[PDB]
């Protein structure tokens, strides 16, 4: 979604440094408001101490700051963040791999549902759409980006993902629960009907198609699960309490105390707490990692591009089972027909990458 | 890619020490430029303090260095590095195992696509090439090493990975999305056509071949996923901010202060901060681990050898389904035909490795 994969292809001088200059889906964009509030509260307190408090009050503030500063402990906060963010990141990738792709059903339906006639065409296209509908229905249930595109079941129909007859059949089936599973049932029934009409040769080929469907159903189930079963609220609250506890301490503890009073650790007044602000970016930004990925189907810069996926899948699916049904290119003898050990060419820039075969560590390289 | 597996086969005296003398894909090669800039900035600051600053300015610098040094904290940085690098290393190996190998399809196509005639040969060879094409297409989409070898679809054709007719069929199919999935559809269709021509006996054998294809498709999908879905930018930025924050502190904090002034902790002036530089190699090098593996399909020394894989697969694939179709050696009685409990010999050096059978922990060894 915010792909910088190509920038970090090689480990050169500024591989990671360069990324500090990027705004989209960045630490700056996510921390902006919070940082400003922190900045404000800090310097506000700072001026109160420098310009308002009396000599006696200043002595209390200095004692208060020494107290607060002693409770700004990074080690405990770093612990809970690391473990929590790891959980979030784990679920994040699991949710991606749970986004259903038509390609596997697509390959089978395209080759195993017979007929070069309009019915055979309508059959294959309708099967794929039942798959894609099964997906779109669950996606608009878990993704705010998708839901805002399909707020009502009418939107689904008018967008061409569901026919008005299908919508009629949809409504006819009375159930208080999410009906995303309906198209998945239709598919299996239609696949069976197709086999009985002789459009699907064996049962071996039919079960194979039914299996790939079930897999897609399992995919939709995972998405439902991650959406339903949030990371326990108490856990989420714990890490924010820990993080905020730290910044609360810093607000007062990291204040620049009187240099004259010669407090151990506070010999220099820089007015601006450079390293404390750098710690804020570190920890608040670290928390923002979880904050953004805790729901990867939202509208964050780094949240998944689910609507593009829907579009891509629609186009590719139908194309593969329609225009590509039993439609192949002209079989030719390959360029290496009489060559048992082919030696494909290399461009000028890639010849260094033509390596001798790795036989194994145990063998002498001679 | 940088295989030292054989060097570290045994745990001897210098098993790991020896690796410190290696340059290829080393910590030295990856840190070179960064280290020099660090070195320079350090000693630059050092001379300014020793030769330029006035007695009063020197006192400020010393107070500034004590301030900076107190913010050079390894524990928080070590935390975020460990967790982040672990994520990177995890994806790194996942991406490797997602590189498709023909061998499984290769075995089935070679034995289950009948015919010792030119057509049977052309059939088997064309099937494998559709697999290898499905792979090469995705690899040149995710690997810069491969793309620079196949920058254009013409390169693919001229290299003998795709026929001009196939390229024509390729273009004929209108789609705005990556067409790496096309050959995978062709394969399934061609496999079905092959079965209808009687070249594939049962549907059981056909579905078995279609399954291994789908598996390869899933492999290609994973590669696409890891390439598309980068590790969240914010996370990457956080760890570089943390790391750089540390080295910023060290630049000033680790300066050798006046020995005469007798600052606690700064009693000795060595001019060169040995241990601070050693910490740089540690942490900057630790970050370089992630920096290099965040995209294992790039052109780093330790990035995958994808082009060799392509070459190896091409050679082996075709060879197994062509020259090796129904082609076996002469069946003989094995050397242990009349021996129920064979005792294969051992070389002089390996006799110590002839062990008695491990029956289980519970049994008395008598």
């Amino acid at each position, epitope marked *: 979604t915010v792909t910088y994969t190509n920038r970090v292809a090689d480990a050169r001088l500024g591989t990671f440094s360069q990324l500090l200059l990027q705004w989209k889906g960045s630490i700056y964009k996510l921390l902006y408001s919070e940082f400003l509030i922190f900045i404000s509260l800090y310097f506000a307190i700072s001026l109160v101490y420098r310009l308002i408090l009396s000599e006696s009050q200043r002595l209390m503030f200095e004692k208060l700051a020494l107290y607060c500063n002693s409770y700004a402990e990074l080690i405990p906060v770093s612990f809970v963040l690391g473990f929590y963010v790891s959980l979030v990141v784990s679920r994040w990738w699991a949710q991606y791999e749970s986004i259903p792709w038509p390609d596997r059903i697509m390959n089978l339906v395209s080759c195993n549902v017979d007929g070069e006639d309009e019915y055979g065409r309508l059959l294959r296209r309708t099967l794929m759409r039942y798959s894609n509908l099964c997906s779109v229905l669950i996606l608009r249930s878990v993704s705010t980006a998708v839901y805002k595109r399909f707020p009502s079941m009418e939107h689904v129909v008018r967008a061409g993902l569901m026919t008005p007859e299908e919508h009629k059949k949809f409504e006819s089936l009375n159930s208080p629960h999410n009906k995303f599973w309906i198209p998945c049932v239709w598919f299996s029934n239609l696949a069976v009907k197709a086999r009985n009409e002789g459009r699907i040769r064996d049962s071996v080929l039919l079960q194979g198609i039914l299996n790939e469907l079930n897999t897609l159903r399992s995919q939709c189930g995972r998405l439902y699960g991650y959406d339903w079963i949030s990371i326990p609220l108490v856990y989420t609250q714990v890490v924010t309490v820990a993080v905020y506890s730290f910044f609360l301490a810093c607000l007062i503890g990291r204040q620049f105390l009187d240099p004259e009073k010669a407090y151990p650790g506070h010999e220099l007044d820089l007015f601006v707490p450079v390293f404390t602000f750098l710690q804020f970016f570190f920890y608040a930004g670290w928390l923002k990692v979880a904050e953004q990925l805790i729901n990867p189907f939202g509208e964050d810069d780094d949240d998944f591009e689910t609507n593009w996926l829907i579009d891509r899948n629609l186009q590719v699916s139908l194309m593969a089972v329609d225009e590509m049904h039993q439609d192949l290119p002209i079989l030719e003898k390959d360029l290496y027909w009489n060559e048992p050990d082919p*030696q494909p*060419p*290399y*461009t*000028a*820039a890639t*010849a*260094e990458y*033509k390596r001798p075969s790795f036989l194994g560590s145990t063998f002498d390289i001679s | 890619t940088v295989t030292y597996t054989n060097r570290v086969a045994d745990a001897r005296l210098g098993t790991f020490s020896q690796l410190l003398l290696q340059w290829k894909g080393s910590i030295y090669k990856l840190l070179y430029s960064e280290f020099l800039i660090f070195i320079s900035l350090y000693f630059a600051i050092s001379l300014v303090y020793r030769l330029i600053l006035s007695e009063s300015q020197r006192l400020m610098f010393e107070k500034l260095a004590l301030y900076c040094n107190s913010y050079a904290e390894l524990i928080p940085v070590s935390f975020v590095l460990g967790f982040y690098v672990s994520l990177v290393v995890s994806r790194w190996w996942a991406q490797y195992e997602s590189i498709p190998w023909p061998d499984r399809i290769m075995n089935l196509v070679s034995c289950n696509v009948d015919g010792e005639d030119e057509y049977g040969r052309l059939l088997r060879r064309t099937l494998m090439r559709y697999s290898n094409l499905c792979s090469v297409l995705i690899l040149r989409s995710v690997s810069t090493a491969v793309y*620079k070898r196949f*920058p*254009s679809m*013409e*390169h693919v054709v*001229r*290299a003998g990975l795709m026929t001009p007719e196939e390229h024509k069929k390729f273009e004929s199919l209108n789609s705005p999305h990556n067409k790496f999935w096309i050959p995978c559809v062709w394969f399934s269709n061609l496999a079905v056509k092959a079965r209808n021509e009687g070249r594939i006996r049962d549907s059981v054998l056909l579905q078995g071949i279609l399954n291994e294809l789908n598996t390869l498709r899933s492999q290609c999908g994973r590669l696409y996923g890891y390439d598309w879905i980068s590790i969240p930018l914010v996370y990457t930025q956080v760890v570089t901010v943390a790391v750089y924050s540390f080295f910023l502190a060290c630049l000033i904090g680790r300066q050798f202060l006046d020995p005469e002034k007798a600052y606690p902790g700064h009693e000795l002036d060595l001019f060169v901060p040995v241990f601070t530089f050693l910490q740089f190699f540690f942490y900057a090098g630790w970050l370089k681990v992630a920096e290099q593996l965040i995209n294992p399909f790039g052109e780093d020394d330790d990035d995958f050898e994808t082009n060799w894989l392509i070459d190896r697969n091409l050679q082996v694939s075709l060879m197994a389904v062509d020259e090796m179709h129904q082609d076996l050696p002469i069946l003989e009685k094995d050397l242990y035909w009349n021996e129920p409990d064979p005792q294969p010999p051992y070389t002089a050096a390996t006799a110590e490795y002839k062990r008695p059978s491990f029956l289980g922990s519970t049994f008395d060894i008598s």
Partner: antibody
Amino acid sequence: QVQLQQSGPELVRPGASVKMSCKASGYTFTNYWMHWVKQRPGQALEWIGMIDPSKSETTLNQKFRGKATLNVDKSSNTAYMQLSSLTSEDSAVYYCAREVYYFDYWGQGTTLTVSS
Amino acid sequence: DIQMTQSPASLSASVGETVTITCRASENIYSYLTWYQQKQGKSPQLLVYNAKTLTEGVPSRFSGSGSGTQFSLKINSLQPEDFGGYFCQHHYGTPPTFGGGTKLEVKR
């Protein structure tokens, strides 16, 4: 149809610098590496260097390290080469070619003459 | 660098004849060799690539062969057009050095 149109011939004084062009058309500019070849009478063709239109990555010949400079303009689909500290020996015919495991398309050529 | 040694420096033959130019590699370049034809004043043209494969326009009378360090171009049944310059180039690595060239002149 693939066509590489280079700039016209040039005439410069020793020590100066020159910058010749090469406009590609009839194919995707960024998907093929652009090379530059030097042609002197009696001598063999010399490879100056190559450029990746996409990322502007250059790879020169050690023999031309300080003499030649490469860059492109993806917007205008043209490639450029700059020759510095020109001498009499820098006088020759300069080509730009497209690579596809081979040089399948060359420019007409750009004749450079250096004398005072 | 890889050195390309071409021979003969110049060949003289009459229409109908069959000639053979030869390029030899300093080191193994597998099947990575190309043959170019260049007529005086004009820019070179691709004849053969990958040591054997002929390009689009090239007529069947042209053929390439070899592998490793020994390659050769063979023009059987010469024509009036086939007279001019001929050189080779390896395509295994950078820099892709060229051959010395060969002048194919008419014999009388």
